[PDB]
């Protein structure tokens, strides 16, 4: 009933496995639609081929900067930035998908996948989905991070799209 998207993750070019997400379009339709379209590539740009640039074990894996590959870039399907839709959903545990930002109302394309409860981000980052399948892949990704977030190998979204 909500949409599902997938990422096929690779590590230094070698496939690791698929992560699928449920997007809570029933609660955050504008934010879900952004991520869904960036995953299908239907606006002529998006997540395919981009990297996870900041992975902090025990916290989260951050990605989605498909324009500058370092945190400084990214763009939404609506323009460079869009508003915080709402903060209905909370950072309740591992597998939550939420927007990265540069302060209030600055959503673009960068996102994070939590590997722990991150409740101090409630009311500041818009939660819009959750890992459905492949949490083991996300845990595998964590192994390549570090305390400052720099990754020890290149972690890429080799392919992505919509399942259901």
């Amino acid at each position: 009933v909500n949409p599902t998207v997938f990422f096929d993750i690779a590590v230094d070019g070698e496939p690791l496995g698929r992560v699928s997400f449920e997007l809570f379009a029933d609660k955050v339709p504008k934010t879900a639609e952004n991520f869904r379209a960036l995953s299908t590539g239907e606006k002529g740009f998006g997540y395919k081929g981009s990297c996870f640039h900041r992975i902090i074990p025990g916290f989260m894996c951050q990605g989605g900067d498909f324009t500058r590959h370092n945190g400084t870039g990214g763009k939404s399907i609506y323009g460079e930035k869009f508003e915080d839709e709402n903060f209905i959903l909370k950072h309740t545990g591992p597998g939550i998908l939420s927007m990265a930002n540069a302060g209030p109302n600055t959503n673009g394309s960068q996102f994070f996948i939590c590997t722990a409860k991150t409740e101090w981000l409630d009311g500041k980052h818009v939660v819009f989905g959750k890992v459905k399948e492949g949490m083991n892949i996300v845990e595998a990704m964590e192994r390549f991070g570090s305390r400052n977030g720099k990754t020890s190998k290149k972690i890429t979204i080799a392919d992505c799209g919509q399942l259901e």
């Binding site: 945190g71 400084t72 939420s98 540069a102 673009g108 960068q110």
Partner: peptide, 11 residues
């Protein structure tokens, strides 16, 4: 965060 990354646990 996306731009100035600060200390503690932010995105």
């Amino acid at each position: 965060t996306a731009x100035x990354v600060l200390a503690x646990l932010l995105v």
